[PDB]
Amino acid sequence: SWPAVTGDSPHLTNFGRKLLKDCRQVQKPIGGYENLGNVIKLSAEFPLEFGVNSVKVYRQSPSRLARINEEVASAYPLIHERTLGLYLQYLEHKCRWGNAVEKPIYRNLSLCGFVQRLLVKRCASFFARNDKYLLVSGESGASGFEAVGTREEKAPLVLANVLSYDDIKLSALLSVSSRTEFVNEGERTNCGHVDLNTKTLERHGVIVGMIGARLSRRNLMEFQDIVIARQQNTRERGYGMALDEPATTRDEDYRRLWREFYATRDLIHGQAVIDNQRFGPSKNKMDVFDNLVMKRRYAISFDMLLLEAEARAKRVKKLAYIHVVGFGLGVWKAAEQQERIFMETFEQRMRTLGNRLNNVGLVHFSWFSITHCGGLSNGSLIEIPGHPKDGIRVLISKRNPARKLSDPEHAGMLLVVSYAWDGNALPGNEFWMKMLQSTGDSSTACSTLVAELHNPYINTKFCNGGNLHIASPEHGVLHIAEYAKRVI
Ligand SMILES: Nc1ncnc2c1ncn2[C@@H]1O[C@H](COP(=O)(O)OP(=O)(O)OC[C@H]2O[C@H](O)[C@H](O)[C@@H]2O)[C@@H](O)[C@H]1O
């Protein structure tokens, strides 16, 4: 399955060659004892009020502060090695094809500095179809982001202060993961309620932010690569070019970035007729859904989930229990066949990675409408030759994210929780607008420590670009410095 595990070594131009070269000198931040003190103080200095206060560090039991200290040092941003090539190609593309507004931002941007831009320049909240937003600096509003990065952008929505839709398209491929304490079971309606003497709460594990495909904004983000529409998929906008056909405009070079990221052609309207294998229906009757590009986008995210859980479980010498949510299948779902592509691609990447998942024990698909998909069914086993437990258990049922792993079948495993995030929002998203129970994003920030540990304004040492980790199927999960040393 795609992407291939071996035979890789990304091509990289001279431009991306050097920026990855300069990453070999990025010092890996080392954790200590005063990590909690900086988080506690910077959390009090955060200019925005939390949705709930119970997830704050100072309200956790002091006997657990030593473990929370290690959890602060365990946080890092994370991208696929596939995405690393795209980031470097994007920087190169913006360096030459950027307008007068974009060029002062993107040139001389190191790789790690671009990741840092994708972390700090997010809005606090950024949701709904009309783009309701709240910035960390306090400004709020709705809409107005399509102008960001152009000649007629208006403050406070300027490229130097917020992200453009081109940035958000790449930020959707950027994840943040960390060990975490679980404040409550993590049901959607938890709203930060704490039951101090509960008997069913797995209190610590791993939390990983996954971002689905945003498909409802026309001509923007994953719509550009997955939905084949009349207005967008034209020859004048870069669509329909061959592999080595050189791009001579900005639109052609932008489409080249994504043709070569997904390793497939894009399509002009009319070339794609629904065959229900690569081309399926969308919600617009006159559009066409690219089932292949949707699979490859989910494939990238699933590699990050499985390789990250395998690294966390390997460090504590345990087996990973991955609580898998359907990111992009909730309020962001756009095709009825997305969930089938979701689970088909998940099982594909589980078999393709294979022995690279020797420390993954169980995959739990929670809140999915499909109950069986190929080898995936409740209680099934994805056979992997050489696996310590002969394979990976599959469970398909509604489950609270932090429900205690009390069963003897799962006793002592490392609970790895995925949650549906946003590329242009801090952990919780609408959590920062006092909406605590509307999505899995806001429910997670009410039940874990992501609002501080996955916050680049609070956990400044370990949640920055200088701590970027690369999920490579070949080399595992490594810090950006070690990945650069081992591929250059
Ligand atoms: N009550 C529920 N309990 C548990 N899971 C549920 C529930 N209802 C739906 N699900 C499943 O929860 C899963 C995820 O649904 P979502 O949380 O919308 O995620 P997305 O990726 O679609 O939308 C993310 C955007 O919305 C946020 O604001 C972000 O910040 C982004 O802006 C699906 O399988 C649902 O069926």
Numbering used by the authors: 11 to 498
Please quote the authors directly:
ADP-ribosylation is a reversible post-translational modification involved in various cellular activities. Removal of ADP-ribosylation requires (ADP-ribosyl)hydrolases, with macrodomain enzymes being a major family in this category. Further analyses reveal DUF4804 as a class of MavL-like macrodomain enzymes whose representative members show unique selectivity for mono-ADP-ribosylated arginine residue in synthetic substrates. Crystal structures of several proteins in this class provide insights into arginine specificity and a shared mode of ADP-ribose interaction distinct from previously characterized macrodomains.
Two of the representative proteins in this group, CG2909, and CG3568, are from Drosophila melanogaster, indicating potential evolutionary connections between the prokaryotic effector and the eukaryotic proteins. Encouraged by the clearly detectable ADPR-Ub hydrolytic activity of the two metazoan proteins, we solved their crystal structures in the ADPR-bound forms (ADPR-bound CG290912-498 at 2.28 Å and the ADPR-bound CG356825-508 at 2.00 Å). The ADPR interactions in both CG2909 and CG3568 are similar to those observed in MavL, with di-phosphate-binding loops and catalytic loops matching the sequence motifs identified from our search. In addition, water molecules equivalent to w4 in MavL can be found in both structures with distances of 3.4 Å (in CG2909) and 3.3 Å (in CG3568), suggesting that this macrodomain class likely employs a similar catalytic mechanism. Adenosines in MavL, CG2909, and CG3568 are sandwiched between two residues and stabilized by π-π (in MavL) or π-π and π-cation (in CG2909 and CG3568) interactions. In MavL, the adenosine was stabilized by π-π stacking interaction provided by two aromatic residues (H142 and Y265), whereas in the two Drosophila proteins, a π-cation interaction involving an arginine (R198 in CG2909 and R209 in CG3568) replaces the imidazolium stacking. In Arg-specific macrodomains, the core β-strand connectivity appears to be the same, yet some distinct differences are observed: In both CG2909 and CG3568, expansion of the variable regions from β7 to β9 (compared to β4–β5 in MavL) and the additional β12–β13 were observed. Interestingly, CG2909, CG3568, and Larg1 all harbor a hydrophobic residue (F137 in CG2909, F148 in CG3568, and V77 in Larg1) equivalent to F105 in MavL in their insertions. On the other hand, E107 in MavL also seems to have functionally equivalent residues in the other three enzymes (S226 in CG2909, E237 in CG3568, and E160 in Larg1), even though these residues are not in the insertions. On the other hand, our study also tapped into the protein-level specificity: MavL interacts with Ub and effectively removes ADPR from ADPR-Ub, whereas Larg1, CG2909, and CG3568 exhibited rather weak activity hydrolyzing ADPR-Ub.
